[PDB]
DNA sequence: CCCTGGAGAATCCCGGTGCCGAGGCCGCTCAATTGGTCGTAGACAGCTCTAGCACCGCTTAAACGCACGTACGCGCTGTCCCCCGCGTTTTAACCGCCAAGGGGATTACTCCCTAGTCTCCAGGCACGTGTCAGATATATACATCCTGTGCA
DNA sequence: GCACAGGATGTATATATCTGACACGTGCCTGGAGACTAGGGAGTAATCCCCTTGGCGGTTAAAACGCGGGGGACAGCGCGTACGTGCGTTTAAGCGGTGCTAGAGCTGTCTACGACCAATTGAGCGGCCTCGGCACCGGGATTCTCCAGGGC
């Protein structure tokens, strides 16, 4: 039976998602996460839907940029697999 | 009808018709352009205010706007923006 | 009614009449308790008179206490040799060397207090003011006192902070630019007399005020030689490129910050500015001469003197002009020896000896106007050509007298190059003003 | 009587509102006084920058075979121009996506 | 509510990494990225709630979110 | 007609000096190609700062660059400096 | 036969010494020449206050020190002890310059 | 009659100039009106921050065995403390030096 | 007689003698402290002005100052500074 | 150890739907027009202190060139386990719809809080001036690092 | 093969000196406090209706889980290379000077033009409807790629 090698499907997904322009996180789980986090600062808070949408946009952009920098660090280590040490190095160099 | 809100949308549309006569724009894109115009305005005006405070003046002038655009825009954009502003002020002075 | 002959404590030598007169004047200064400035020209045994003063103050007065002499470094060995030759009864020590030698010296000779005179340099005084400040100084002697002619300078402040009883300044040019310098010297001498900052109201009053504190013996008492000099001003006009650059400088990419300093060199040679010379070929052929008025006149002048007596000294204030002149002399194939600040001292002395060798083929000796050490005995030369004039006429006089020394035989002609309708006219007029001030005040 | 009112934008030959820019400057607490040439200069600069971005975005949309500018086109225009990318480096554009880019080590050998 | 960081699922993290341009992902990346997301969200939500409180509102607005992002240096065009 | 240049001014930032900077940075071994890279990095940074400082000096209609102008340029860059006003 | 320290002891001593002090590690006159040369291309006939050059040197040295810290971190990431132009370029790329 | 002048700093118990802060606010073009309690609040906050930094710097000076504070002590105090490090993260202190820090790999073993 | 320059040196010295009676401060450390006070003042005042513009108000008040403090200061500093300022405003309002 | 040959994915072209973008109308509030005034900035003059240019003289610390040896960067190899690609089953997200009421948003009213003004006075700044804290030097005491050698 | 003695190096330490910057005291003047008035911003109450939140049911894409295998991470080894260490030589930095300007800052005035405030009015701009061309969705035929097997 047909079977793609380990890495061609990943490249296809890379091209597809770099072509697309839509959000990649489920909106109801993200909304629940936002409300949970907001419970720590005030009670009975209400949100505009636009507020949750903007939060998701910012979070996705931050994560995508972080993953780009992490990929660069992994390539620097002469690897193709990214690691928590790469994420930590990217954050440390950024200033976080 | 609630309170009226001000946006640069019609002026953006006029510029767009000048540049590409038969090309349109969507609502999200116009919102992005409005946000861009507001951000650029605030950057330039704040820089000019700082310049006036530094030189111990009380009026924001065309010289302050020119210095602010030199400070904030990079390179060729700064040159072309300076040229456009100088042309506009020349026409305004001569044609008023 | 004072010492009328050569003193006895000074052995191997009879002091001349002017020497003994100066010694008597210094003794009168000590007796009256007034500090004085001794400026008896450039060759009338000033060092010998100072040594005789210290010898007297130790022998006929019983104060062999600490004495300090401040000298330029180049004169330290001369001072020590003179001390050992003329008056060896005194005990003189010299402080030089790096930090380890200075520490060893202070631990060995200075602090134990077995010496009587100390001969140090300006730099060593600045370094060891901490240890020299402790002692009580009976007599302080400062040679070439025009070093401290300027107040607000560290050396003047430091020499003021010492604890002294008597003070003596040796110089030849007390007045160089303005009366503030003379007041600065006199204020170091007698701070309680000249505490203030500043022909019945002038000239004569100034003479009467200065006479109790000063003594100048022109080099005319001896004479009997040294035929008088003669100064000729040669006026030159700008070349065409020089005119173009003069207009470019006045009207206003090269930075032109000190406009006066750019106009000057422009009056010397347009080649100094970057790119004024022709392109990459970079050849030395007749476009150096023709692009400078001083250079065309100099090329018309040098061969005539050469077929005549030759042995010409050329002075300038720019090492760049020295480079250009060296290239010209290489192209025309004369003989040149160069001396400026970048020349090491051994090479300097070798060049002086080689030019002064009794029968040599050398023709042009080029010097920076301030790069000498008041020595330099170029007495075999005949003609002095001043490419550039200095704001300080004493600098020009010293440049002249480097070739007007006692060994001179024939009269010397001094050629001063001036551009007409430039800033050189201003420079020369200011120099004339300063020289007239100096002559009227000090010379008379 | 009074002459027909000519807008300052018409006097300056611009398409952005000089009077509105002047009011925004006056109400913004930037300085005590505002000169007459400052609003004209600022409006001209805004017009130039807007024209630049719109031109690049329209070119990108045409290369995508569309006629309406969308945030993807705006993001492509901004990120494919060095000066505008230097200006908008800290800006996130909603629904703009990212530039296609894969590091050469990751491509199959 | 509780247990909502686990709603950010592994496939979503894979999609975000693929848009970032990565090919191979280690198994421990997911907890790390959940931590990063939580700290980022906490900072932004704290600032937005401060703005909302100052306005004496009980609703958080997209304007508050935009203002918080701009003060943190993360300007967001597309909402006002 | 005598030309003799001295050296490039970017070479005045010397290899031992760059080594001292790396020591304060905490570096143990340094490659030989680091020095040219560091010279380029320093040149770029200085160019940005000096361009902004000159813009301020021109606005003030002066020809002298002041420490305050440098401080304002650094604050524009985002590199606040304390200790000069 | 003469006593010699191993390759790395003196480097650590220098690290501790220069992390203990606060002086400037670059020569003032060469730095001043560099600054004047750079400003020449922006505007001729420029004069500098001496305090401006000191502030410039302070900022430049701080920038270089921070860059070298990040470079060292990247070199340790690559399982190395020697810093390289690759490490400098990676640090700059991540920082966004 | 008239009463003796009492400074607003004395009234509030602050060692910082309430009146000078009020004047600086009014001349800084931040808003067209400034409240009464705003300068008091701002001066108190500035005082708290200054007191924190000076306390830490004095502790660092005691560790260094000197009775005067220098920029080195200020830098050591600002670093080594996370709150002030976040506050002054992008700030350079002139001749302040750097923290002693050697990575674990670089040590001999 | 030269011009008048204003600085916070007097008050910095007062706080220094209040928190460490036997300790001194050098001129350069005073310069740094003065610059620090200026920078913090400007950050807080700018954030308060932006808040007033956002809420369409014209008065900078203690509420705006408190909100700016909470926005700018990280955590423990924020809450302690809030307590300090509340103490000060209470003392000023109570009997002054 | 690359060439056909299958398969999977993606692309292009062609036709049917829907949804808002772009136009046309209405009403209002905000900018443009005149007129008058005042205060800010431009222009000038007179002092003082710093910065640029071209030199000199001297001291000395640091850069520089060179040579040797040694950690180390780098390539190569083998092993193992871990992440990837695929298929099955479950789960909860999405979407549409409905319902209720909490809070955002606007308006009217009034009061109280701040800006502006004029006196009055004391707190803060420039200016002098002394003394002591720290820098530096010197001579020890000690802690570290490295090697050679004696012992299994 | 490992561990220790010892030598040499560097470093921490106590003491003594000296100097230049910190800290204090003084006069005075400029900005802050006291007391008042006047007016507009904002606090307060009340109404509306929009937008949020909660709930429910049906679909279906997406998540979770388990399998099987090849590729990538990682440890180890060998080598030769480039960097660290130290030494003798050279250079240029650093300090202290000349000599002349111009530049820039604080002081003090004068003065005129440009920005501000106010009162009218009418045109530009924002909100509201309405409609059709573009964007989207599906469907079918097509091209490109990726993997595997072997006669090249
Ligand atoms: N034996 C001597 N005694 C006194 N003066 C002499 C003697 N020999 C030479 N001189 C003079 O010394 C001058 C040069 O020496 P110089 O350094 O000026 O000495 P000083 O500084 O003592 O005058 C010459 O002009 C010469 O006249």
CSV table of C-alpha atoms in Angstrom, one decimal, chain C residues 12 42-51 69-87 92 94 96 119-120 143-144 170 349 373-377:
chain,number,residue,atom,x,y,z
C,12,UNK,CA,89.2,76.3,36.4
C,42,UNK,CA,71.5,83.7,24.6
C,43,UNK,CA,75.2,83.3,25.1
C,44,UNK,CA,76.5,85.3,28.0
C,45,UNK,CA,77.1,82.5,30.5
C,46,UNK,CA,73.7,82.4,32.2
C,47,UNK,CA,74.3,78.9,33.5
C,48,UNK,CA,77.8,80.0,34.8
C,49,UNK,CA,76.3,83.0,36.6
C,50,UNK,CA,73.7,80.8,38.2
C,51,UNK,CA,76.4,78.3,39.3
C,69,UNK,CA,67.1,73.9,39.5
C,70,UNK,CA,64.4,73.3,36.9
C,71,UNK,CA,65.7,72.7,33.4
C,72,UNK,CA,64.6,71.3,30.0
C,73,UNK,CA,65.6,67.7,29.6
C,74,UNK,CA,68.0,68.5,26.8
C,75,UNK,CA,70.1,70.7,29.1
C,76,UNK,CA,70.4,68.4,32.1
C,77,UNK,CA,73.7,66.9,31.1
C,78,UNK,CA,75.1,70.3,30.3
C,79,UNK,CA,74.0,71.6,33.8
C,80,UNK,CA,75.6,68.6,35.5
C,81,UNK,CA,78.8,68.8,33.5
C,82,UNK,CA,79.1,72.5,34.3
C,83,UNK,CA,78.5,71.8,38.0
C,84,UNK,CA,81.2,69.2,38.1
C,85,UNK,CA,83.7,71.4,36.2
C,86,UNK,CA,83.3,74.9,37.7
C,87,UNK,CA,82.2,74.4,41.3
C,92,UNK,CA,74.4,68.0,42.9
C,94,UNK,CA,69.9,64.7,39.0
C,96,UNK,CA,65.5,61.2,35.7
C,119,UNK,CA,68.7,69.3,39.0
C,120,UNK,CA,65.4,68.0,37.8
C,143,UNK,CA,65.7,77.8,33.5
C,144,UNK,CA,63.9,78.9,30.3
C,170,UNK,CA,66.4,82.6,33.6
C,349,UNK,CA,72.8,65.4,16.0
C,373,UNK,CA,66.2,72.9,21.4
C,374,UNK,CA,67.8,76.4,21.3
C,375,UNK,CA,71.1,74.7,20.5
C,376,UNK,CA,71.7,73.5,16.9
C,377,UNK,CA,74.9,75.2,15.8
